[PDB]
């Protein structure tokens, strides 16, 4: 909304630069960028009062190149990525370099990986509501699952007659490993959507779940047999059913 | 580095309350208080002294007494999620973040009907689903890494105002079936297994 951080999800080989933008609110001139851990720690890394820069630290300083250019969007990018830069990278636009209120973007989380070869999309598929359901209770559950992913950075949405719903949808909060004892293992999520047992036996009403992955870019190379592994969008559908 | 939150976790029943506190070891000028749901970190409060109120949540702040509180009333489903203060310590000027709670909000099932439900894809393959238990039961992983089981996930029907929890579980295996799909979970003794 009022911070618009792109992407929301990377994925890089070691070596490689990545590269996150930043467009701050509106009227608010000071742009934080912090990198969040996995225990929920908020590291500091630099900020800038239009283009210039007002704090940061040594390693934002070495590690990585930030501006923020006039009339365009701020952007950080680590100049060669290592493992140890995966993280949530969050920018926070505010009035002033202190005492005032920050408002955050959806961060972009980036994975540093030694090989773009185990990246993978999903495959999705939908199941059907079950009759038992729906003689049960007279609701009827549709579930998505998403499979074969890697990295796990995708974004799940149902869509009904064309339009994104959120009402009675749930979607598990982390995807799971297919081989959880196994590094580099693909994952798995799956998402329920659940409708009166009316509105799934309307024939005329239409159902689709949605995954966004993110992956390889243009720029990408792939010499590998199988297609490139890019950003792209998946989905599985199923159209409703009479008795 | 950090705030001192607590609590650390917290689950709460819909419809109930409480407070998350965070003690300061030195004089601060404001703190913030947000939220986050994968979702963004969403701003609820920001003060310097006294209190605010927006709905369900207050906040207060006493810089002197170095503490603040959120308080959640008749807490929703909706209010799930990690919260965190944020304070600028007078003496660096600079922000510090709380360590975090976990907030879990419970939904109330009226009617549990603990069920598991064979579904079939859309275009041989099938899940299985275990639904309408009540939030007193709980959903174990499997031991063989051959079948996967999702932790449970609370939906919200809001034109039925209707709440209900379900995990998934699906195999390859040939030795797969609904009926022991979910053997590795104590589910209810009056759980319904169709056909």
């Known amino acids: 909304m009022k911070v618009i951080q792109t992407p929301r999800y990377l994925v890089k080989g070691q070596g490689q630069k990545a590269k996150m933008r930043c467009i701050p609110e509106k009227g608010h001139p000071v742009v934080f960028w912090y990198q969040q851990n996995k225990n929920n720690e908020f590291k500091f890394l630099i900020n800038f009062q239009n283009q210039e820069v007002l704090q940061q630290i040594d390693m934002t300083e070495k590690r990585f190149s930030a501006e923020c250019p006039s009339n365009s969007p701020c952007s950080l990018e680590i100049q060669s990525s290592e493992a140890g830069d995966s993280a949530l990278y969050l920018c926070a636009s505010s009035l002033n370099n202190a005492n005032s209120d920050y408002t955050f973007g959806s961060g972009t989380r980036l994975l540093v990986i030694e090989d773009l070869k185990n990246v993978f999309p999903p495959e999705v598929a939908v199941f059907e509501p079950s009759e038992a359901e729906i003689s049960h209770t007279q609701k009827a559950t549709l579930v998505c699952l998403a499979t074969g992913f890697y990295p796990d950075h995708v974004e799940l949405s149902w869509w009904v007659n064309g339009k994104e719903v959120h009402s009675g949808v749930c979607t598990d909060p982390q995807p799971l490993k297919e081989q959880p004892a196994l590094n580099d293992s693909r994952y798995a999520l799956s998402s329920r959507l659940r409708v009166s047992a009316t509105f799934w036996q309307n024939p005329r009403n239409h159902f689709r779940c949605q995954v966004q992955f993110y992956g390889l870019s243009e720029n990408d190379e792939w010499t590998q047999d199988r297609a490139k592994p890019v950003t792209q969008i998946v989905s599985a559908e199923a159209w409703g059913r009479a008795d | 580095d950090q705030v001192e939150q607590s609590p650390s976790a917290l689950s709460l029943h819909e419809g109930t309350g409480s407070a998350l506190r965070c003690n300061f070891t030195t004089t601060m000028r404001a703190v913030q208080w947000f939220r986050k749901n994968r979702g963004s970190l969403i701003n609820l409060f920001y003060?310097?002294?006294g209190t605010k109120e927006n709905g369900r949540l207050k906040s207060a702040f006493d810089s002197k007494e170095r503490y603040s509180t959120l308080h959640i009333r008749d807490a929703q489903l909706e209010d799930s999620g990690t919260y965190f203060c944020?304070?600028?310590?007078?003496?660096?000027?600079?922000?510090?973040f709380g360590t975090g709670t976990r907030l879990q909000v419970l939904p109330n099932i009226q009617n549990p009907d603990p069920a598991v439900y064979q579904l079939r894809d859309s275009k041989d393959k099938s899940v299985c689903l275990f639904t309408d238990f009540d939030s007193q039961t709980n959903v174990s992983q499997s031991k063989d890494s051959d079948v996967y089981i999702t932790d449970k996930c609370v939906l919200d029907m809001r034109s039925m105002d209707f709440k209900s929890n379900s995990a998934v579980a699906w195999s390859n295996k040939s030795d797969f079936a609904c009926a022991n799909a979910f053997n590795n979970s104590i589910i209810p003794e009056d759980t319904f297994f169709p056909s």
């Open positions: 944020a304070a600028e310590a007078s003496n660096t000027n600079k922000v510090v």
């Open positions: 003060l310097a002294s």
